[PDB]
Amino acid sequence: GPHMATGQDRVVALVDMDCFFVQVEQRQNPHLRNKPCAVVQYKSWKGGGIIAVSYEARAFGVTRSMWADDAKKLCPDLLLAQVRESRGKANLTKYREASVEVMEIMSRFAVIERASIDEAYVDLTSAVQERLQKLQGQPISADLLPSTYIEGLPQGQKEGMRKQGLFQWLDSLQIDNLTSPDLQLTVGAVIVEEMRAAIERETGFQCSAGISHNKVLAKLACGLNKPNRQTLVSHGSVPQLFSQMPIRKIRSLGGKLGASVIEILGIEYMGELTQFTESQLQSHFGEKNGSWLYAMCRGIEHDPVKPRQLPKTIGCSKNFPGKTALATREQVQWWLLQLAQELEERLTKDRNDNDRVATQLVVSIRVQGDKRLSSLRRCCALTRYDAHKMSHDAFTVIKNCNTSGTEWSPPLTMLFLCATKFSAS
DNA sequence: ATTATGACGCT
Ligand SMILES: Nc1nc2c(ncn2[C@H]2C[C@H](O)[C@@H](COP(=O)(O)OP(=O)(O)OP(=O)(O)O)O2)c(=O)[nH]1
Ligand SMILES: [Mn+2]
Ligand SMILES: [Mn+2]
Numbered sequence: 001g002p003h004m005a006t007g008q009d010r011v012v013a014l015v016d017m018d019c020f021f022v023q024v025e026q027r028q029n030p031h032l033r034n035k036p037c038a039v040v041q042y043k044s045w046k047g048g049g050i051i052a053v054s055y056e057a058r059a060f061g062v063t064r065s066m067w068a069d070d071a072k073k074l075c076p077d078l079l080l081a082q083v084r085e086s087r088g089k090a091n092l093t094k095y096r097e098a099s100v101e102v103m104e105i106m107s108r109f110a111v112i113e114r115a116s117i118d119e120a121y122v123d124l125t126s127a128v129q130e131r132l133q134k135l136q137g138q139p140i141s142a143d144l145l146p147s148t149y150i151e152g153l154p155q156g157q158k159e160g161m162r163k164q165g166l167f168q169w170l171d172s173l174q175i176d177n178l179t180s181p182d183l184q185l186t187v188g189a190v191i192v193e194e195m196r197a198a199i200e201r202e203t204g205f206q207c208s209a210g211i212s213h214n215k216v217l218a219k220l221a222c223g224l225n226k227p228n229r230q231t232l233v234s235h236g237s238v239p240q241l242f243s244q245m246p247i248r249k250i251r252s253l254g255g256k257l258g259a260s261v262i263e264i265l266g267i268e269y270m271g272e273l274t275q276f277t278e279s280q281l282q283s284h285f286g287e288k289n290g291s292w293l294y295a296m297c298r299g300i301e302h303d304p305v306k307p308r309q310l311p312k313t314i315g316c317s318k319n320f321p322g323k324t325a326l327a328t329r330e331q332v333q334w335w336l337l338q339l340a341q342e343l344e345e346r347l348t349k350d351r352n353d354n355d356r357v358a359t360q361l362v363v364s365i366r367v368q369g370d371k372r373l374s375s376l377r378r379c380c381a382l383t384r385y386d387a388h389k390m391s392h393d394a395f396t397v398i399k400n401c402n403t404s405g406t407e408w409s410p411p412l413t414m415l416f417l418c419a420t421k422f423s424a425s
Numbered sequence: 426a427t428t429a430t431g432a433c434g435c436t
Contacts, residue, residue: 041428049427065427083429090429116431288434313431321426418431 007213007300008181008235011124011188014218015106015195015209018227020118021052024098025081027204036060037079040068041090047072048082055227087338089318092117093346101203103309109195113306121215122195123305124188131187132178139175140183142166144190148211149225152237169232182234185211189232196230214301219251238299242270250296257289273297310354313362315418316343325368325411332408332415333395339417340391347385347419358382358419363394366414367401373414376401382419390417 017023021039026032036057040048047068060075071078084091099117106112110127112120145166153165174180189211200206209230210221221233233241247261247270248254262268264284265276273281274297282290295301316339326332351357361382367375378397382390394417402408 045426051428067427092429311431315430317429319426319428321428324426416430 005300006181006235007295007298007302008184009125010213010305011128011184011211012214012218012305013122013124013188013192013195013209013211014115014215014222015120015122015192015199015207016222016226017102017118017205017207019052019054020098020205021083021095022054022081023205024095026054028094029081032079032081035079036062036075036077037081038062038068038071039081039083041083042085043068043082046070048080051083087341088335089316089338089342091342098203098205102199102205102207105199105202106195107309108198109191111305111307112309114309114311120309121218121305122192124191124211125184127191128184128187131191132183135175135187137176140170140173140186140190142170145186145193147193147196147229148189149229149231150237151221151224151231151233152240181213182236185213185232185234189230192230213299215303215305216251216296216301217299220245220249235299239271242297242299245270247273257285261285261293270297312422313418313420314343314346314350314358315416316340316346317414317416319366319414320411321413325413326415327408327411329402329406329408332398332412333391335415336391336394336417337387339415340387340394343390343417343419344385344387351385351425355425356422357385357425358422360419360421361390361393362416362418362420363397364414364416364418365398365401365412367410368413369410370413374416375414379420382421 022037025039037054038050038057039052040050042048050066050068050071051064053062053064057075057078062071062075062078068080084094095117103112103114103120106120106122110122110124112122114120148166149162150165150169153168173183173186175183177183192209192211196207196209206228208222208226210218210233211230212218212221212233213235217233221231224231246268248258250270273293278290278294281293285293320326326335347358359382360379362377362379364374364377380393380397
């Protein structure tokens with residue numbers, strides 16, 4: 001009862017740019033705006049692989065990881081923007097720079113953890129306390145939440161539903177209690193409306209967000225009402241929400257561990273997890289996963305919002321699938337050099353912007369017919385930002401994989417260089 | 426022949 005802590009101490013938001021690469025291209029090219037459009041990498045093989053899809057295009061069934069020539073069968077008016085190609089490979093620089101614009105705006109409101117190029121987590125606990133003191137008991141007006149959904153409401157036209165649910169939530173609110181978790185979430189949501197307004201003002205990019213008490217629920221909330229909307233998932237809404245939530249929808253359960261939860265326990269939905277003791281879950285899935293699942297099915301998660309706005313590694317990768325697999329020494333060298341040249345560019349810019357140097361170079365390759373995604377991963381020292389040296393060292397470090405007697409065998413289907421182990425410079 | 430990344434856990 002009174003001692004069962006409920007994981008309601010924090011206010012955490014997950015902000016996610018809607019179809020981010022598409023929006024970046026649509027800011028740059030107005031002819032793409034408010035159209036079915038997608039972003040592709042390469043164009044020769046089946047029109048190129050799609051990596052981002054506007055919501056208008058998604059309404060036709062266009063999805064990520066789909067060939068453009070197939071998407072065009074579903075959506076013949078689909079517009080396509082192409083990823084920049086440099087030194088023979090995809091170059092994602094435009095989107096990393098757009099991402100940094102967005103991150104820098106979010107950082108003005110709270111500390112953020114960059115979770116990927118287009119999404120960050122936000123720790124709003126301090127910001128909400130400050131704002132709750134600034135209101136001095138003043139109640140929260142629906143006008144402050146023009147794009148917010150309250151999950152699970154209303155109970156007992158899309159925008160009409162949204163406003164009814166918001167009204168129920170606000171009427172149920174105890175504004176005099178500066179320590180009510182639900183009030184904290186509500187104020188967090190007001191701040192997130194402001195953050196999203198600033199992001200759109202200052203970049204033109206729209207985003208969705210989730211507001212809850214931890215990262216997993218913030219992330220799950222964010223996806224309930226997309227695009228250009230934010231969803232508040234309260235502690236009290238967890239039992240109903242989870243009672244029909246497929247386990248795979250929860251961050252980190254979408255793969256093998258989630259599948260084994262489903263198969264071993266004989267369940268489908270997140271809420272069924274509550275029926276097992278912590279020890280049972282630890283027995284099936286290990287001590288960490290067990291504790292995490294026992295708390296998470298009750299809506300409780302303690303993973304902190306790490307104050308990290310910048311990537312921890314800087315990486316360059318290219319697949320060589322099918323018959324393009326690299327089969328000679330000259331080929332492997334030239335592509336290691338192209339990779340090392342892009343990496344050198346990104347690293348020098350990183351050192352100038354962010355006052356840090358990487359110290360370790362990781363070289364990963366795949367060989368043809370290998371089942372694994374990394375056939376080999378080996379590290380060496382990274383002592384100067386010079387593409388020729390980095391490529392020479394990556395070769396030095398992988399060359400004993402060649403089993404030929406000038407040739408390369410098994411041919412390589414992936415090269416990958418990653419600078420890691422940053423130190424302040 | 427979804428591809429390009431990037432975080433993080435296990436050992
Ligand atoms: N190169 C590459 N980029 C990817 C891949 N998956 C996603 N991206 C890029 C394009 C996406 O716009 C961006 C962020 O991914 P998300 O899962 O958040 O989807 P996106 O923002 O496109 O749409 P959303 O509104 O979040 O449903 O990262 C991939 O497999 N390869
Ligand atoms: Mn997104
Ligand atoms: Mn995302």
